[PDB]
Structure 1
Amino acid sequence: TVGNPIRADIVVTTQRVRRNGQQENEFYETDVKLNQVAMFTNLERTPPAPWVASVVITDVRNADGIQANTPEMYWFALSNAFRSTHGHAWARPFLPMTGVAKDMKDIGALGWMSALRNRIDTKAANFDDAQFGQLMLSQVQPNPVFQIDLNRMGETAQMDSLQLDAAGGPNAQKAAATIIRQINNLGGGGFERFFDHTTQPILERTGQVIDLGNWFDGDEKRDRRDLDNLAALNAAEGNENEFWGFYGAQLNPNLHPDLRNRQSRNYDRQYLGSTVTYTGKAERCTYNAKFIEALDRYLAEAGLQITMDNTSGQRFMGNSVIGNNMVSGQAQVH
């Protein structure tokens, strides 16, 4: 609403489609947008594929056509946000686009952390779609974990407080009860059967104290979230003990969070322009892996005919299924 920007490169929009023959309105938008969710992709690392993909939901606001903000719209938007692992749509922003060398977003930075210490010639002609689809299977695990940035003083603060309390605290049980009641008051198909609440938690805080700011370049503003792990790798090149330093300043257990927040601010001033300004503080959390699947199964069984398309040169690259049957171990007959 205000001039503050939010980092968002993947927007999933759900809208109704008129099947009445498309008459008496040629190229007229009318008002069919139900709701949109805006999110980006972050690349974490683990001590298989080392890099693990992560999708952070940032904007959850519904379309301007509707003027009422109710919990059911919020849960509809969260259900919509899952519809991105189909076709590996979360990997689309990592795809290089021809003609632009804006840097701090290229995929070649992963090469600095591979066996060879070199950056892949991403912009060159030898880097084609088939080669890119290799870099992904070879490098990032093909399953995206789902994160979300809860805002204590945001647009949906009165609604984000429920999830923040459900993350764990004195009112954690009451928060779980009320969130279960709210989600069940959307389809009426008995959410208890698909997924309980006492069995396991719904979302866990990762301890990050990521905060919302604003930084200016190129004659426009942009959100401070633009500096993810990949951007830091691109900016600081293949040098070591400074990318891991940045990752540690992002999160470490064996230090007070104030020092790591100061280090993160120093790094933000270092890599990007010093003209950055800070507005508010948020809290990152990770959703349960199967809670989102249960929510999607609920929405499917209640009945929502949702249609996709597109999705991700085409020369054959291996069976990808023969590895299932290895029949390890001989009979060892005496």
Structure 2
Amino acid sequence: AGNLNSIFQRSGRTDGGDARASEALAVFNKLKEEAIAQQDLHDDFLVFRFDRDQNRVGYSALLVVKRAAINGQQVIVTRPLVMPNDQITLPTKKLTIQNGMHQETIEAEADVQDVFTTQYWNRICDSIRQQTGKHDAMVINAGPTVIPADFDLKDELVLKQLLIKSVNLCDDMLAKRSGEQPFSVAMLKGTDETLAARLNFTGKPMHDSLGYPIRSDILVSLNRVKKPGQQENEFYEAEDKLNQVSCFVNLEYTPQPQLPPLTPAIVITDVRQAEWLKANTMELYLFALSNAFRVTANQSWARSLLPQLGKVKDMRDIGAIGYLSRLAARVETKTETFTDQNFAELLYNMVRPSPVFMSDLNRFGDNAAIENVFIDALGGVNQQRAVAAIIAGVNNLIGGGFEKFFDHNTMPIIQPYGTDIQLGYYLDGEGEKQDRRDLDVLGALNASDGNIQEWMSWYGTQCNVAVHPELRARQSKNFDRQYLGNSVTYTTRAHRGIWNPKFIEALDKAIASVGLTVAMDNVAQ
């Protein structure tokens, strides 16, 4: 039946494609042409519609496609843009859950993680070959992403930017397949140049390529490598930035058989190079990750936990920590008698001194071509290859020697965190988009106003991973409706993992050990 595609597709063309993939193709072709007209985009490539009608996927997508022949092989790099359609329902999957002696099945919709199967990709490749004529071509996966059903398609600015970013990545991957030279400390280490860095206690969120908010408590900014006394580059003005890492810190309530009860879980939510640089490679990513390490290694992250004193509406007010402590009460942090010293004491008794470094990993994110190696490095059939790629990336940064710090085959680079991440946003009182991750441990304690039993039910939902994830997802959504509100939109899900402490030691020390010295701007607190 599915093998009749061999007859169905032999000749001719048809009238088909869903309403969103149709509209999306039309706007993306318009944007391509305007970008060429304004000379922002080069006219060396093609945009294609992938149909659920003409070919074998549940979800249609547009394909950002670039090509070159590399050493005789035709190579195509594709960055799919999934187009979910609110009016189209793909048949659901049966989730059978063996609840001890009780067996029950939950049916559920396929998300981009379930949709982007290995065959989904292979079908994308085949259609491109039909559309490009390159039937013997190899196709590079730049990472599928999704442009969600919900918003109006008239945002030409964002859509233009999506094409721009997607072609950037396509050029990188053709280049890196072509053998292009890597990013390294040697390029930064001018004989007359040094690095410096600071922690930004932002007070604001940051936004992905489609404009959705990303939680961050601290933005780590690594300054441009340079030195006073160097030749000024004519009449210029520039931001002195090299890269940045977005992160936040939760306070996880963790077991112990003497440590205090909460863990300073430092979570990377995003990794970006400064906007003036176009390329996106593993070496650039890996180098930037050292920015999160310094958050607790040299500086002190705990300043981010200070309550917004004077602000009534602080949903994550530290005062909530008193509900997990022996007080079983909110600390009065509204008062003129609440001091910096009292804050430090709450933490002395409640929060552990040893930082833990972890990060989100998203196969469908803005950095998916790279996120995918870090995800496969967690485990599975190609873990060894993904790990080899990552250690090679750091060695490219330092000129070898990562191996002088530890054995990557005894110490895999990233461990699973188990509980995965539901992403989404909610609207605040003025209708702005805010990250749903705000109901973190302090957030949830204030949301239940001290009802510890309600908190613990939620907390167990977010921690006990012997419970099938569908059951956990349903309870997590039930809790958002009661505590966050009904104005909640869900977005593409993601993985989380723990960076191996030895990977971290080797990355940070190896860079410092080759002379790429970085000064702290916050010289003392």
TM-score normalised by structure 2 residue count: 0.57
Residue of 355, 363, 369 corresponding to 1:158: 369
Deviation at 1:25, TM superposition (A): 9.3
Residue of 298, 301, 310 corresponding to 1:90: 301
Distance 1:29 1:293 in 2: 36
Distance change >3 Å, CA 201–CA 23, structure 1 → 2: closer
Letter in 1 for 2:284: M
| Deviations, residues 95-153 of structure 1 (Å, cap 9, x unaligned) | 12332122221111111122222211112122211222222122101111011010110
Deviation at 1:291, TM superposition (A): 2.1
1:221 is the counterpart of 2:416: no
1:141 is the counterpart of 2:349: no
Moved more, 60-69 or 189-198: 189-198
Letter in 1 for 2:242: L
Residue of 213, 226, 249 corresponding to 1:5: 213
User: 2:318 is matched with which residue?
Assistant: 107
| Deviations, residues 7-32 of structure 1 (Å, cap 9, x unaligned) | 11200011125412898999x85142
Residue of 114, 127, 143 corresponding to 2:338: 127
1:261 is the counterpart of 2:506: no
User: 1:169 is matched with which residue?
Assistant: 380
Higher strand share: 2
Letter in 2 for 1:35: N
1:287 is the counterpart of 2:496: no
Letter in 2 for 1:138: N
Distance 2:479 2:325 in 1: 24
Distance 1:87 1:300 in 2: 13
Q: What is the total number of aligned residue pairs between the two structures?
A: 311
Q: Which runs of structure 2 are paired with 1:25-36 in the superposition (5 Å)?
A: 29-36=237-244
Letter in 2 for 1:166: A
**Structure number with higher relative contact order (C-alpha < 8 Å, ≥ 6 residues apart):** 1
Deviation at 1:216, TM superposition (A): 0.9
Distance change >3 Å, CA 114–CA 20, structure 1 → 2: same
- Alignment partner of 1:60: what SS? strand
User: 2:268 is matched with which residue?
Assistant: 57
Distance 1:286 1:23 in 2: 42
Q: Which has the larger radius of gyration?
A: 2
Letter in 1 for 2:398: G
1:75 is the counterpart of 2:286: yes
- Alignment partner of 2:358: what SS? strand
- Alignment partner of 1:142: what SS? coil
Deviation at 1:33, TM superposition (A): 1.1
Distance 1:94 1:38 in 2: 16
Distance 1:24 1:61 in 2: 25
Residue of 231, 242, 252 corresponding to 1:44: 252
Deviation at 1:87, TM superposition (A): 5.7
Deviation at 1:298, TM superposition (A): 0.6
Distance 2:394 2:297 in 1: 24
Distance 1:294 1:21 in 2: 31
1:297 is the counterpart of 2:506: no
Q: Which runs of structure 2 are paired with 1:220-239 in the superposition (5 Å)?
A: 220-239=432-451
1:243 is the counterpart of 2:455: yes
Distance 1:161 1:31 in 2: 31
What's the Cα RMSD here?
2.0
1:278 is the counterpart of 2:520: no
- Alignment partner of 2:496: what SS? strand
Distance change >3 Å, CA 25–CA 126, structure 1 → 2: farther
User: 1:203 is matched with which residue?
Assistant: 414
Distance 2:233 2:271 in 1: 33
Deviation at 1:280, TM superposition (A): 0.5
Percent of paired sites with the same residue: 52
CA contact (8 A) 1:150 1:164 kept: yes
- Alignment partner of 2:249: what SS? strand
Distance change >3 Å, CA 253–CA 213, structure 1 → 2: closer
| Deviations, residues 215-259 of structure 1 (Å, cap 9, x unaligned) | 111321111222211100111122122111111111313321110
User: 1:20 is matched with which residue?
Assistant: 229
Distance change >3 Å, CA 11–CA 22, structure 1 → 2: farther
Letter in 1 for 2:518: I
CA contact (8 A) 1:31 1:65 kept: no
- Alignment partner of 1:242: what SS? helix
- Alignment partner of 2:294: what SS? coil
CA contact (8 A) 2:308 2:314 kept: no
- Alignment partner of 2:513: what SS? helix
Deviation at 1:86, TM superposition (A): 4.2
CA contact (8 A) 2:416 2:497 kept: yes
TM-score normalised by structure 1 residue count: 0.88
Distance 2:482 2:328 in 1: 24
Deviation at 1:297, TM superposition (A): 0.6
Distance 1:254 1:305 in 2: 45
